[PDB]
Design a protein around this motif. Structure first.
Motif, short mmCIF file in Angstrom:
data_model
loop_
_atom_site.label_atom_id
_atom_site.label_comp_id
_atom_site.label_asym_id
_atom_site.label_seq_id
_atom_site.Cartn_x
_atom_site.Cartn_y
_atom_site.Cartn_z
N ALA A 193 0.86 -1.18 0.00
CA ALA A 193 0.00 0.00 0.00
C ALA A 193 0.90 1.23 0.00
O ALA A 193 1.63 1.46 0.96
CB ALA A 193 -0.93 0.00 1.21
N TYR A 194 0.84 2.01 -1.08
CA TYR A 194 1.54 3.28 -1.09
C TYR A 194 0.77 4.26 -0.22
O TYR A 194 0.08 5.15 -0.72
CB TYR A 194 1.68 3.83 -2.51
CG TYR A 194 2.71 4.93 -2.63
CD1 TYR A 194 2.40 6.24 -2.29
CD2 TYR A 194 3.99 4.66 -3.09
CE1 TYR A 194 3.33 7.24 -2.40
CE2 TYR A 194 4.93 5.66 -3.21
CZ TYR A 194 4.59 6.95 -2.86
OH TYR A 194 5.52 7.95 -2.98
N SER B 208 -0.23 9.58 -2.84
CA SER B 208 -0.21 9.59 -4.29
C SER B 208 -0.83 10.89 -4.77
O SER B 208 -1.99 11.18 -4.46
CB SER B 208 -0.98 8.39 -4.84
OG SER B 208 -1.11 8.46 -6.24
N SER B 209 -0.06 11.69 -5.50
CA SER B 209 -0.42 13.09 -5.63
C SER B 209 -0.36 13.59 -7.07
O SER B 209 -0.20 14.79 -7.30
CB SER B 209 0.50 13.95 -4.76
OG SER B 209 0.66 13.37 -3.48
N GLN C 170 -3.34 2.77 -3.09
CA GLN C 170 -2.91 4.14 -2.84
C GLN C 170 -3.89 4.84 -1.92
O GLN C 170 -5.10 4.58 -1.95
CB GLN C 170 -2.76 4.90 -4.15
CG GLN C 170 -1.96 4.14 -5.18
CD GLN C 170 -1.90 4.84 -6.52
OE1 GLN C 170 -2.14 6.04 -6.62
NE2 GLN C 170 -1.60 4.08 -7.57
N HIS D 284 -6.26 7.31 -8.25
CA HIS D 284 -6.47 5.87 -8.38
C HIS D 284 -6.42 5.17 -7.02
O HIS D 284 -5.66 4.23 -6.82
CB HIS D 284 -5.44 5.29 -9.33
CG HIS D 284 -5.49 5.88 -10.71
ND1 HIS D 284 -6.61 5.82 -11.50
CD2 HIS D 284 -4.55 6.54 -11.42
CE1 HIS D 284 -6.36 6.42 -12.65
NE2 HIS D 284 -5.12 6.87 -12.63
N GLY D 285 -7.23 5.65 -6.09
CA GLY D 285 -7.23 5.08 -4.76
C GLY D 285 -8.41 5.56 -3.93
O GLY D 285 -9.53 5.65 -4.44
N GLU E 277 0.04 9.42 -10.84
CA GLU E 277 0.46 8.65 -9.67
C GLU E 277 1.97 8.81 -9.54
O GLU E 277 2.64 9.17 -10.51
CB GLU E 277 0.07 7.18 -9.81
CG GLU E 277 0.73 6.47 -10.97
CD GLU E 277 0.32 5.02 -11.08
OE1 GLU E 277 -0.56 4.60 -10.30
OE2 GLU E 277 0.87 4.31 -11.94
N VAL F 212 -5.04 11.58 -3.94
CA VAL F 212 -5.07 10.40 -4.78
C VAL F 212 -6.08 10.58 -5.91
O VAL F 212 -6.98 11.42 -5.85
CB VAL F 212 -5.40 9.16 -3.93
CG1 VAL F 212 -5.14 7.88 -4.71
CG2 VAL F 212 -4.57 9.18 -2.68
N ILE G 133 -0.96 -3.08 -5.75
CA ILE G 133 -0.58 -1.83 -5.10
C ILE G 133 -1.83 -1.00 -4.87
O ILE G 133 -2.66 -0.86 -5.77
CB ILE G 133 0.45 -1.04 -5.93
CG1 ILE G 133 1.69 -1.90 -6.19
CG2 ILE G 133 0.83 0.23 -5.22
CD1 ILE G 133 2.73 -1.20 -7.02
N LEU H 230 5.98 3.93 -9.11
CA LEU H 230 5.13 2.76 -9.26
C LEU H 230 5.36 2.06 -10.58
O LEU H 230 5.29 0.83 -10.65
CB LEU H 230 3.66 3.17 -9.12
CG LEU H 230 3.32 3.81 -7.77
CD1 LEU H 230 1.85 4.19 -7.73
CD2 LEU H 230 3.66 2.86 -6.64
#
Lengths: 1297, 346, 86
Positions: free
Chosen positions: B83-84, B88-89, B119, B126-127, B96, B124, B117, B100
């Motif tokens: 898990a990042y 993620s910014s 995020q 994609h999370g 992302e 974020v 993975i 990654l």
């Protein structure tokens, strides 16, 4: 932190040091004007189109931006190409004049007065003489300002440049120039704020404050005067805007003065947004400030509002959204629109006529002048700090709820919702089923258990109710679009390719077979014939031979002939007759009419098959009346019969398949048929239950459906922890209606405000959770209030785009099981072990049941929102003994936690549970459901989902993402029995009846049918063990429980009046009373022995697997009473061989005795390509000797290099259940001193022989005159009869193949 | 121009117990305006690139080498769950963090491929969005990479920053499976922060190190907890004190160097140490004749630059030709000029 | 931090061990993907990656893994001398 329609972040930032001014040296000026290209040096195009060579708006730079063009230029603009030519000419000419006087070598060091330079240059390209200015081009900056240097000559120098003893007046230069083709109406054009007009304003430079007072006295009667206090460029100066307005910037809400303010404010905001401590700047405060004809008391005009914002902007405030470096007309309009929106004016700092107040805590630093003064607002909410901006998102966002300690009553939640929700809504369904099939096959002729047709189950009474029919149609739509018939046919032909005759173990079909697609070839979709024919003609289907020809019939044919299949037909006959005929097209619900149609078509279909052929037929409605006639008429027309049932959408249709067309068959109705029908209707009922939650198509989502969507829309919301904050209340209310599902979030910027929408799917699970609440918890707002991006608009679709993975299916099934189990009325409490911090169990349990849940991690939900008597959360580790202190309950559970906990504890399952269960018993618990991972049916790894380790008892999940131990079922059950001798045990896995579907579809998640078999297998590896101590356990005499053998089962009980049932594969298989009982799994006798208080069941199982048993009485629900397993017969086939003296290398090969059970019929086969193919008899054969099977075979010089197997014989497949390598033949040598035999090893097995290292023969193409002594053998004896054998007189040979 | 001079400190390896209260703390002037200004100035001076990309790559290079001490096998493994947790910014041109792509592709040598993975954070796409300061309904992972800033809501309010750091550390540990590994970026290794670390999380892992990449002058560090378990025995030890002392030493050293550089917008009036001096002459006639002004100016300018290089240009105008002579003035040049008693002629 | 960083000493004795022909012996693949084949006294013996389903007489699949990585099994040979082509 908002002003009217403008949104501001709570952090302050601004630069910290002012760059000092320095005048331009004479030489440097010449360099700028002599630049080989002036673009980017003296002017810049904001609008260049590289496709052409044109731009339309130009921005000017200091030496030029003082120019005011004469009107002849304005009223007739030139194009860009003329512009660049015109400027380069004028610049060079102007240089010549400046250098004709003042030779460079004597004047390079002198400083030019910027004011004089600007005026002189402006007149020059206005074609007006400039001689007066040239005398005063320079000044000594150390001795005077550029202003005071001029005031030495106080008189009207020229008509546009007038200077008093203290001040200078001149028109303001144009900062922008519009070329040919300019159009403000185009929203994408760069904004100019009207500065392109030649006379938009007028500037008055002044040398001292009294002069400033004198000027203001004159201007008091005109428009509003503006001024910069921080750093007035070349010097202190007022400016008087033109009293008119500018077109295109708004709905006429504008005068010229307002435009100057609003654009100035925008610049101030932009600088605050990007100022850095390491960078000096010319001016901290970019704002203008009005000094005449102004109302501090009112805020109903743009100028007032802009001023009120400017007074706040100087403190270093930033906007929540970035503003463009080069704003376009659209950008400005949006800014003004927000500025004119309804809202409160800020009143932290009051306006004062010619002094500005600053907050001492602000990063702002005042200059030396008297125009600034510190001030103390009472409740200023801002703080110093930088703030970065995040790019916008292409996807709607998802958030995870987190709660504050505040909570709200239900009524407030509802009313806050009902006035903010999009109550009637338009949605899209998407596709529920993505593809694949769940297919099942039932051999009928295999079952010897006769079963009268009159006792068959029949169609449910409601099967043609409108509602069920409507749902049936609705489900048909919801499948992803594809060719239904193509997949359906493909499944059947896959079975047909494997069909093998039982008597002689050879495939029923053959190459060049004759086929009639008797089913209606109907120009399906884009083709003129059913697409499956293309695969068949091309041999695309593996294992299926090529037909010699294909003929088509029906109503909708093109490449065939039209005829009615209900009558006699003038046709030939075929090897395969594929009758894909509908019956419903002339009988919607008229069953007897449908039955007659089905029977007639069946008869004709049989009549078109040759002897020994095979025919299949699709039946829409397997009705007991239909079945009755089938065995009344066609009972003798074929040898065998099966049922193939693909499931593409919810339908009760089936495929009959008659093998071995002959005259004297003996087909019967048997219990296999009853089992299949019961399973079939079970699935349809299960699917129908799932569909009930789905709304129909055209209906807008008024909140009556179970699977609907709830949404709330807010405009410029201001979330806060303040009480009664409507956005917060609505937010909490909507969340409470969705929690188990995901929560979506979007921000869409309109031309004015920004619209925010929050939405998610409501499900029956959410209803259960909401019922558990006593109050609605409030959310933590930081995550939301921090979001200042923009997003794509919402979607509002019910089903996702991608099918769920297998693991989720298993989870849903167990949730379905638990949800049902927890409905027992005799449960007063529950302890859950290893709950997620999200207490998902709350969604499954009826709200009236007391629950205690536990985890090492803290809970994720505000416990204050529930009744403490009904819910409790305990943080701790139930692996430790210290965990059990004061823990009381009557029942417990642990799902998807035991193996992980055991792995963390570094121990096996058996040890782990042995120290756990006693604690639960000590806690007063009585029954529990435990999810142990163990292979119940067989040890077999799922290729990627689960890998079974053997050198240590461990599972690997997702290719090793997660690793857990496991145990074997029999040792585990014995261990459990040791712990608790008087408790009942049972097992539970995913049902093949798919009753758990509503927890997949009814929750709005899509699916692929082909995964279901894997999911069941997955469950078979991870069963749930149900332990119950409040009832005596089950028992059976022959504990190994072998198949097909009498076994006695005891169920101690007190009431002979009770009723019994036994289930298998999720359907009842035995049920009844001691007086009378019915079974579909073998002979069953039920008796009650009162002296022992037991029910005695004597049973002869006819199929293996798990069987679970229940007891019931009239006033009670059914009671589980354990379960038992039936084991298959052993796989041990054994062969017995002759001595080497009886190794018959002669033509008459020798014979070997087979010792095996009669349950496995056998034949000799070759594992050619991953599948066994039956060998021709003349090389090996299983012998049907009267006492037992034997094995005759002959020896050939190819045998040592090949492998052959004794294979199980079933009509479904060859060598499926067992396949035994005949190892001896693989390793038998040949006597050199004898005549020997040789032939090719495969159907196309080219081979060559090497006699003792000497090349001997290409056995494929031996010498036309053969080598001496060798001869062609009489009997074939090759792998396939087509090849002959060649006999060799003696010697030793090799085999190159 | 680029690169990094990093350093790694194994803390658990040091057996010498050291009480946390005696740790060195942040320098008193560390949040003075001037030092902060120089800190920002240095940030601009580095060549433009993705700071996080380099920073993350350095850490994962270490992680790929991390091996458990008891059984000498790598802590990570193929198909491990990651898990990042860091924000993620949508960094720069991507949506992302760029690291990654390398991780998914196995670009990093020695690093196994994760199975999946996930995020989290504020920025974020994609999370999922959530605050890491509270409890989280997130399940668990084998690797938790917590690249979270603390300064975004605490400029210089140290106790506020400490609470944020401690809270984020706790949640990060809670998301790790048993035997897992978690890393956390800390902006300010304050002795108060260290005190609470050993007061609370002392038993949650087997081992601990400090990874310190240096991309620009900053006091931030990376913690790394190996062997997520229940009964660890981590303590403050002399290794920690050594690392902190070395860290602040570099930070002070860099700051001293920056003092010579002028800020951006200011024109070079000759007050800065690292400024430029230039002289312009038109059609000069150099000669050994006395009082020849071009010769005098030439000698004077040279005397102010000598240790550095001396540049020379002749640009022809439409009339005369303008000549310019210039070079960088440094404190070294000042010392040399102080040694002179008279200016030599060239 | 790392494996074999400070010191790493080869066990040279194992590289020189002589295998007695007169006894049962052991064979397996040398690497994680180390395909190998055997040659008994100059006579080709087996593709140890995929030994023939009719195994050469006397050879058998060993119980304990003992390969380079536990995934590969060992195969015991009754006697003889063999080569290793990898």
């Amino acid at each position: 932190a908002a002003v009217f329609g403008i949104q501001l972040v709570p952090k302050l930032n601004t630069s910290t040091t002012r760059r000092t001014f320095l005048p331009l040296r004479f030489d440097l000026l010449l360099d700028r004007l002599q630049s080989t290209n002036l673009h980017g040096v003296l002017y810049r195009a904001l609008d260049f189109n590289p496709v052409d060579r044109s731009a339309t708006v130009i921005q000017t730079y200091p030496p030029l931006n003082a120019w005011s063009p004469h009107p002849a230029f304005i009223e007739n603009p030139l194009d860009y190409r003329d512009w660049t030519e015109f400027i380069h000419d004028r610049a060079l000419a102007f240089v010549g004049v400046l250098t004709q006087r003042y030779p460079l070598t004597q004047n390079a060091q002198r400083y030019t007065n910027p004011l004089v330079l600007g005026a002189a240059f402006g007149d020059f390209l206005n074609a007006r003489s400039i001689d007066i200015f040239l005398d005063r081009l320079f000044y000594g900056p150390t001795q005077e300002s550029p202003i005071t240097s001029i005031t030495k000559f106080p008189y009207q120098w020229t008509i546009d440049f007038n200077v008093t003893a203290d001040s200078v007046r001149t028109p303001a230069g144009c900062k922008y120039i519009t070329l040919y083709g300019y159009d403000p109406s185009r929203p994408s054009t760069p904004a100019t704020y009207g500065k392109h007009r030649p006379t938009y304003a007028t500037v008055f430079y002044y040398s001292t404050l009294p002069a400033r007072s004198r000027l203001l006295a004159n201007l008091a009667a005109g428009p509003t005067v503006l001024e910069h206090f921080d750093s007035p460029t070349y010097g202190p100066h007022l400016l008087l805007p033109q009293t008119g307005d500018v077109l295109g910037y708004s709905s006429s809400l504008i005068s010229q003065a307002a435009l100057l303010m609003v654009e100035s404010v925008m610049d101030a905001l932009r600088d605050n947004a990007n100022a850095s401590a390491s960078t000096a700047v010319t001016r901290l405060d970019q704002s203008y400030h009005p000094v005449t004809s102004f109302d501090p008391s009112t805020f109903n005009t743009l100028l007032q509002r802009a001023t009120n914002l400017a007074l706040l902007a100087v403190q270093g405030v930033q906007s929540e959204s970035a503003i463009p470096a080069i704003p376009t007309m659209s950008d400005v309009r949006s800014f003004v629109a927000r500025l004119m929106a309804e809202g409160d004016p800020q009143q932290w700092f009051p306006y004062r006529v010619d002094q500005i107040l600053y907050w001492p805590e602000s990063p702002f630093v005042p200059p030396i002048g008297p125009f600034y003064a510190p001030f103390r607002p009472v409740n200023f909410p801002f703080t110093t700090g930088s703030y970065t901006v995040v790019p916008d998102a292409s996807r709607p966002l998802r958030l995870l709820p987190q709660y504050r300690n505040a909570t709200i009553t239900v009524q407030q939640a509802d009313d806050a919702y009902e006035d903010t929700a999009l109550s009637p809504l338009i949605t899209t369904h998407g596709f529920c089923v993505t593809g694949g099939v769940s297919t099942s096959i039932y051999d009928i002729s295999g079952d010897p258990t006769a079963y009268p047709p009159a006792q068959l189950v029949d169609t449910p009474n409601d099967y043609f109710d409108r509602e069920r029919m409507a749902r049936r149609d609705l489900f048909r739509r919801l499948r992803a679009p594809a060719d239904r018939s193509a997949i359906k046919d493909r499944a059947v032909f896959d079975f047909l390719a494997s069909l093998v005759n039982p008597t002689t173990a050879n495939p029923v079909l053959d190459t060049s077979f004759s086929m009639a697609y008797l089913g209606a070839s109907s120009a399906h979709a884009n083709a003129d014939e059913p697409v499956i024919l293309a695969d068949i003609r091309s041999g695309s289907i593996p294992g299926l031979p090529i037909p010699r020809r294909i003929v088509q019939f029906g109503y909708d044919v093109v490449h065939g002939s039209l005829l009615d299949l209900s009558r006699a037909v003038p046709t030939g006959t075929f090897g395969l007759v594929y009758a894909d005929l509908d019956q419903v097209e002339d009988a919607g619900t008229d069953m007897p009419a449908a039955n007659r149609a089905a029977i007639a078509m069946l008869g004709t279909a049989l009549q078109m098959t040759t002897a020994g052929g095979v025919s299949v037929l699709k039946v829409n409605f397997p009705t007991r009346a239909f079945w009755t006639q089938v065995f009344n008429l066609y009972a003798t027309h074929a040898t065998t019969l099966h049922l193939v049932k693909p499931t593409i959408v919810n339908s009760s249709e089936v495929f009959l398949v008659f093998g071995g067309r002959q005259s004297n068959g003996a087909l019967r109705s048997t219990t296999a048929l009853q089992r299949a029908l019961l399973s079939l209707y079970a699935r349809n009922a299960a699917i129908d239950r799932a569909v009930t939650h789905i709304p129909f198509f055209g209906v807008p989502d008024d909140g009556t459906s179970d699977l609907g969507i709830d949404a709330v829309r807010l405009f410029d919301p201001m979330f806060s922890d303040a009480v009664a904050n409507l956005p917060s209340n609505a937010l909490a209310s909507l969340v409470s209606r969705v929690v188990p599902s995901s929560i979506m979030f979007t921000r869409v910027p309109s031309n004015g405000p920004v619209s925010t929408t929050i939405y998610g799917k409501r499900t029956f699970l959410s209803n259960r959770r909401r019922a558990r609440l006593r109050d609605v918890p409030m959310l933590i707002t930081t995550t939301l209030v921090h979001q200042r991006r923009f997003t794509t608009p919402p979607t509002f679709t019910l089903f996702s785009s991608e099918a769920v993975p297998v693991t989720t299916l298993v989870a849903a099934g167990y949730n379905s099981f638990i949800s049902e189990q927890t409905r027992n009325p005799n449960l007063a409490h529950l302890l859950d072990l290893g709950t997620g911090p999200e207490c998902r169990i709350l969604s499954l349990i009826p709200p009236t049941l007391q629950v205690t849940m536990s985890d090492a991690r803290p809970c994720a939900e505000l416990m204050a929102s529930f009744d403490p008597a009904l819910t409790a959360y305990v943080q701790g580790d139930y692996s430790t003994a210290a965990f059990w202190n004061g823990i009381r309950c009557d029942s417990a559970t642990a799902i998807f936690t035991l193996g992980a906990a055991a792995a963390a504890a570094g121990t096996d399952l058996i040890a782990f549970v042995q120290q756990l269960i006693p604690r639960i018993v000590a806690a007063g618990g009585t029954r529990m459901w435990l999810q142990l991972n163990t292979p119940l049916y067989e040890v077999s790894s799922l290729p990627d989902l689960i890998d079974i380790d053997l050198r240590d008892r461990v599972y690997r999940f997702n290719g090793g993402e997660r690793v857990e131990p496991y145990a074997d079922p029999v040792p585990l059950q014995q261990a459990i029995a040791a712990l608790l001798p008087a408790a009942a045990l049972s097992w539970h896995t995913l049902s093949p009846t798919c009753d758990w579907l509503p927890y997949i579809i009814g929750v709005g998640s899509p699916l692929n049918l082909s995964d279901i078999n894997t999911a069941i297998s997955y469950s078979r590896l991870t069963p749930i063990l149900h332990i119950d101590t409040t009832t005596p356990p089950l028992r059976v005499n022959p504990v190994p429980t072998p198949l097909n053998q009498q076994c006695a089962i005891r169920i101690t009980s007190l009431d002979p009046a009770a009723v019994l049932s036994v289930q298998h594969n999720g359907v009842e298989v035995i049920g009844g009373t001691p007086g009378n009982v019915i079974s579909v799994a073998g002979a069953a006798a039920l008796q009650y022995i009162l002296a022992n208080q037991e029910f005695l069941l004597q049973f002869t199982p006819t199929l293996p697997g798990i069987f679970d048993v229940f007891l019931t009485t009239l006033g009670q629900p059914p009671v589980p009473r354990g379960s038992f397993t039936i084991t298959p017969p052993p796989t041990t086939v054994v062969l017995n061989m002759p001595p080497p003296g009886q190794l018959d290398f002669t033509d008459v090969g020798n014979d070997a005795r087979i010792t095996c059970d009669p349950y496995y019929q056998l034949a000799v086969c070759i594992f050619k390509d991953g599948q066994y193919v039956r060998v021709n008899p003349e090389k090996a054969s299983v012998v049907t000797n009267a006492p037992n099977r034997d094995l005759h075979f002959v020896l050939d010089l190819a045998d040592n290099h090949v492998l052959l197997y004794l294979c199980d014989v079933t009509p479904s497949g060859l060598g499926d259940r067992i396949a035994f390598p005949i190892v001896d033949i693989y390793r038998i040598a040949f006597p050199r001193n004898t005549p020997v035999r040789a032939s090719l090893p495969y159907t196309g097995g080219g081979a060559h022989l090497t006699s003792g290292g000497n090349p001997f023969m290409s056995l494929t193409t031996p010498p036309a005159v053969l080598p001496a002594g060798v001869a062609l053998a009489a009997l074939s004896t090759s792998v396939a009869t087509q090849y002959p054998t060649y006999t060799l007189p003696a010697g030793v040979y090799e085999y190159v193949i």
